[PDB]
């Protein structure tokens, strides 16, 4: 599993929990949706882009 479309609209807390069940060694970083980010590929990383209410606003994916 490398993408979690079912997590869009969920809390960032639930997203971290679910992602760590599927990928326990994931390096999760929470960032504001609508920011610009580095374009290196990290297979250990899952960025979580959140709206101003701390709900997931973009499909989480490994990278």
């Amino acid at each position: 599993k490398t993408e979690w479309p079912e997590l869009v609209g969920k809390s960032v807390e639930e997203a971290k929990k679910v992602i760590l069940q599927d990928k326990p060694a994931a390096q999760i970083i929470v960032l504001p949706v609508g920011t610009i980010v580095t374009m290196e590929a990290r297979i250990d990383r899952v960025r979580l882009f959140v709206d101003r209410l701390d709900n997931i606003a973009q499909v989480p994916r490994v990278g």
């Binding site: 609508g34 980010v37 580095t38 374009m39 290196e40």
Partner: protein, 281 residues
Amino acid sequence: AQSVPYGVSQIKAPALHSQGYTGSNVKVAVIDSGIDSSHPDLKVAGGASMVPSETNPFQDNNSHGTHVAGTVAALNNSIGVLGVAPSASLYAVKVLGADGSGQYSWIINGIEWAIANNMDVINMSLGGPSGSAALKAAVDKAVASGVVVVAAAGNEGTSGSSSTVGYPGKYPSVIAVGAVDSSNQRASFSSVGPELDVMAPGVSIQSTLPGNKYGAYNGTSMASPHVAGAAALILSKHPNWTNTQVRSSLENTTTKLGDSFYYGKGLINVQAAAQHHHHHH
């Protein structure tokens, strides 16, 4: 002893170095997380930070900007790696914080700094899935002002027949760069779409890292500075060429690979780009 990373050889940068051209006097802004100016394999000529809480552009708290910078311009000496354009004047334009992210206004402020300080080339190994009018205006302005603007195409992989190139790479004025490996195969993460312009090495790319280290990174972030460095090599051999001409020289002399949806025009070849007469190999 110095090592020449495979990607520098793959884009045929050593052919320009042997002709005597290494990017001297060409000003390249690495608009990124900073550049560790204490690294002995880098020489940083200047810069500025647009990150409110990290005001020193010569401190790279992420590592990404320093790696990108080394692919552009790691020094030609007896250590570490060799850069594509090892004599280029390198500027640290810090618009990303430690966590790898920046607000659109920080990126735009960095592009404006680059324009105001007469940069010849901008590299943006960065992206996001949406654009903004202000972001498009900044890149268009840089291009109108004569700057070669190069960006990572993005690491979004494929999505059926949809484009997955991110911004600012997706804007027509910006050269969007995808990633291939040492066998010229597109990396599985490399973004796709009609906005993909050219490809460069983006798999297992050795470069400089903060605290006098080196290491292999993957990404269209790694591919972009091969093309920004190539632009600097071209300009050092043809200092009157416009950005229009530099861009066309790179596009018109790629080694064609697969379908342009996945590969754009193919792999850049800076040897061929820097000749007067251009054709694909």
